C-alpha cells in the first residue's frame, strides 16, 4: 500500500526474454497455424465466433512497440492464441493438437525461464 513498498523482481531482462521465447515459438514446426492472422474474409465462423483474434505476428509487432506493460500481459496474449484454438477447433484437429503442443511448449519456456 501506500510507502509500503514490495520486494521486487529485477525485470530488467524481461523484455529481450519475452523475445527469445517468442521465437522459439515461432521457430517451432507446428507454429504455422499461429504465425498469421486468421483470414477473417476466408475462415467461416471465425469474425463472429472468436471475439478477441491474436497471432504471433501481432504479439510480435507489440513487443516491439511497447505495447506489454509487464511480462504478465504479454503471456495473457500467448495463451489468448491457444485459448482461441481450443475454442474454434477439435482437440485432435491439425490445427487443434498444434495449439496442444504449442501451449505445452510454451508453458514450459514459461516456467524454465521466469520461476527459477
Ligand atoms: C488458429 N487457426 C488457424 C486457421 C488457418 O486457416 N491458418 C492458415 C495457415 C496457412 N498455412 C501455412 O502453412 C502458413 C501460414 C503462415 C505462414 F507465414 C506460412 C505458412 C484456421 C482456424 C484457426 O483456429
Redesign the pocket.
Known sequence: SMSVKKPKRDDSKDLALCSMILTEMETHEDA?????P??LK??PG?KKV?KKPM?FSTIREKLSSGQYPNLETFALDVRL?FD??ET??EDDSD?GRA?HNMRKYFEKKWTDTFKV
Open positions: 504455422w497455424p499461429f504465425l498469421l486468421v483470414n476466408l475462415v471465425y472468436i497471432d492464441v482461441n484454438c474454434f477447433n490445427i495449439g
